[PDB]
């Protein structure tokens, strides 16, 4: 956990933006009032999180997890008979 104050984060802001993107680790901004505590995350890591939340919210990861552990077998994608549904 990387934790810093609002004051120090603002002074070190440009390096912080570099750091969150090269370490792939969020930085916690924790100040006087937990009201305005925040987290800074690299855009790429945020897009992964956004995409994960979307596939969980639709139930897609639910179905993925079920199919992953089932015994239905596999089929090479080129062997799919599309005209038979």
């Amino acid at each position: 956990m990387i934790i810093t104050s609002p004051t120090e984060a603002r002074k070190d802001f440009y390096q912080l933006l570099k750091n969150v993107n090269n370490n792939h680790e969020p930085i916690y901004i924790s100040g006087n009032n937990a009201e305005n505590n925040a987290v800074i995350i690299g855009l790429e890591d945020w897009k992964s999180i956004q995409e994960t939340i979307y596939l969980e919210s639709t139930g897609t990861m639910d179905k993925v997890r079920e199919r992953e552990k089932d015994n239905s077998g596999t089929t090479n994608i080129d062997d799919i008979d599309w005209d038979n549904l």
Binding site: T52, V64, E66, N76, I77, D78, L85
Partner: protein, 87 residues
């Protein structure tokens, strides 16, 4: 191909909806990239969280994804979903 691309049989029902949406061409373009480099930064390729599980998605369109895992040692791609509705 660099990779064999497979689909879980329980996921074939997704392909029926892909076909009936006229998304087959879009889906097959993802397949062609999966055969070549399933890690290519195209098609909105995303590493899903938790990243230690190593699942991935690509966009068929704004709504539907191909969700898959990759067996790096055996050079096989396993498609687990190609339809992002819960039935």
């Amino acid at each position: 191909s660099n990779y064999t691309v497979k689909i879980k049989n329980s996921a074939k029902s997704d392909l029926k909806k892909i076909k009936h949406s006229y998304l087959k061409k879009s889906f097959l373009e993802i397949v062609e990239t999966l055969k070549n480099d399933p890690y290519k930064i195209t098609q909105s390729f995303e590493k899903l969280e938790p990243k230690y599980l190593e699942r991935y998605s690509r966009r068929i369109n704004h709504q539907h994804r191909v969700v898959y895992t990759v067996d790096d040692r055996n050079k096989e791609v396993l498609i687990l979903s190609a339809w992002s509705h819960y039935d």
